[PDB]
Amino acid sequence: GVTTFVALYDYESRTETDLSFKKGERLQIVNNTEGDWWLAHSLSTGQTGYIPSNYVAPS
Amino acid sequence: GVTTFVALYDYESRTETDLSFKKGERLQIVNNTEGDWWLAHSLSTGQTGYIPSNYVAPS
Amino acid sequence: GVTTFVALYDYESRTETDLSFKKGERLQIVNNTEGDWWLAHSLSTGQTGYIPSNYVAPS
Amino acid sequence: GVTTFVALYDYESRTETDLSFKKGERLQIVDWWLAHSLSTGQTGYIPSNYVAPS
Ligand code: NI
Ligand code: NI
């Protein structure tokens, strides 16, 4: 199936480009080569934005 | 590092491998930016494709 | 939903790490930061491997 | 370009926080390295001393 990560914690947006999400939300990672901020697409909300990589774990 | 640009104009692309986008859409720029066309991920839609560098500026 | 690419042409695996796919196949791109070869996970077959970057377009 | 390593040993991540893998599994590398498994398509960190160039 689609490979995803799962949110370990809620995250509230603080910037124009980050992605808010709730604990347990399934996220498809689009780009994870730029250090601690990964570009993610939420499979719940359809939104796309940067996430703190330490808030997620492989599904 | 995470590099985000913003579209200055609407663009309706001419091939499926180039993104169409709207003015104000934010785009993560990936890879080598030495040409006129840059690989990008849309923060509006999550799609990936090439964009014309003259249509974007740092966000 | 899941953000995907579609194969533009058939491709037959020739190495231990590339991925076979057929024209029209829906693929997840896991990495596309390294240039001419991207890492894909097929949503049609479940297989994973490198693909030529110019063989796919956003769905 | 794409950098592929191969696992020299099995590794079972106690919690599913790092990548679990088997000996012989190939991994794209993008003490701990972020990797994509070419067997499962999963992504996670792996211990660099468990891998060698494929
Ligand atoms: Ni799968
Ligand atoms: Ni979506």
Task: Looking at the structure, give the CATH architecture of the domain made up of residues B4-58.
Answer: Roll (2.30)
How far apart, in Å, are the Cα atoms of C33 and each of B50, C38, D43, D47? 13, 7, 15, 22
Cα gap B24→A57, rounded to integer Å:
32
What does DSSP assign to residue A11?
A: B
Q: Are C17 and D4 in contact (CB under 8 A)?
A: yes
Instruction: List the single residue in B with minimal CA-CA distance to A49.
Output: B43
The residues facing B58 across adjacent strands are B5
Q: Are C34 and D2 in contact (CB under 8 A)?
A: yes
**Cα Rg for chain D, rounded, in angstroms?**
10
**For residue A43, what are the contacts with CB-CB under 8 A and spacing of at least 6?**
A2, A4, A25, A26, A27, A28, C1, C2
Shortest Cα–Cα distance, B8 to chain C (Å) = 22
What sign does the CA torsion over A41, B28, C57, C28 have? negative
- For residue D13, give both structure tokens: 């991540």
Q: Which fold would CATH assign to domain D4-53?
A: SH3 type barrels. (2.30.30)
CB-closest option in C3, C35, C54 to B47: C3
Residue keyed to tokens 């001393």: D49
What does DSSP assign to residue A15?
A: S
**For residue D44, what are the contacts with CB-CB under 8 A and spacing of at least 6?**
A57, A58, D13, D17, D18, D19, D20, D34, D35
| Residues of C with Cβ-Cβ distance to A1 under 8 angstroms | 43, 46
Residues C24-27: contacts with CB within 8 Å, 24+ apart? Answer: C26/C59, C27/C51, C27/C56
Contact check, Cβ <8 Å, C29/B48: yes
Q: Are B49 and B17 in contact (CB under 8 A)?
A: yes
Chains B and D are touching, with contact defined as 3 or more CB–CB pairs separated by less than 8 Å: no
C-to-N gaps above 2.5 Å in chain B, after residues: none
Tell me phi and psi for residue C54, to 5 degrees: -85, 5
Cα gap D25→D5, rounded to integer Å:
9
Q: Are C43 and D10 in contact (CB under 8 A)?
A: no
- CA-based nearest residue to C19, from D15, D32, D26: D26
Q: From 3.90.950.10, 2.30.110.10, 1.10.1240.10, 2.30.30.40, which CATH number describes the A5-58 domain? A: 2.30.30.40
How far apart, in Å, are the Cα atoms of B57 and each of A59, B23, B34, B52, C13? 36, 11, 15, 11, 39
Can you say how many angstroms the Cα of residue D25 is from the centroid of all Cα atoms in its chain?
7
Residues of chain A in Cβ contact (below 8 Å) with chain B: 16-17, 28, 30-31, 33-35, 37, 39, 41, 48-50
How far apart, in Å, are the Cα atoms of A49 and each of A22, B15, B44, B47, C29? 14, 25, 8, 12, 17
| Pairing mode, strands D26-29 and D51-53 | unpaired
**Cα Rg for chain C, rounded, in angstroms?**
10
Contact check, Cβ <8 Å, C49/D38: yes
Q: Are C3 and C27 in contact (CB under 8 A)?
A: no
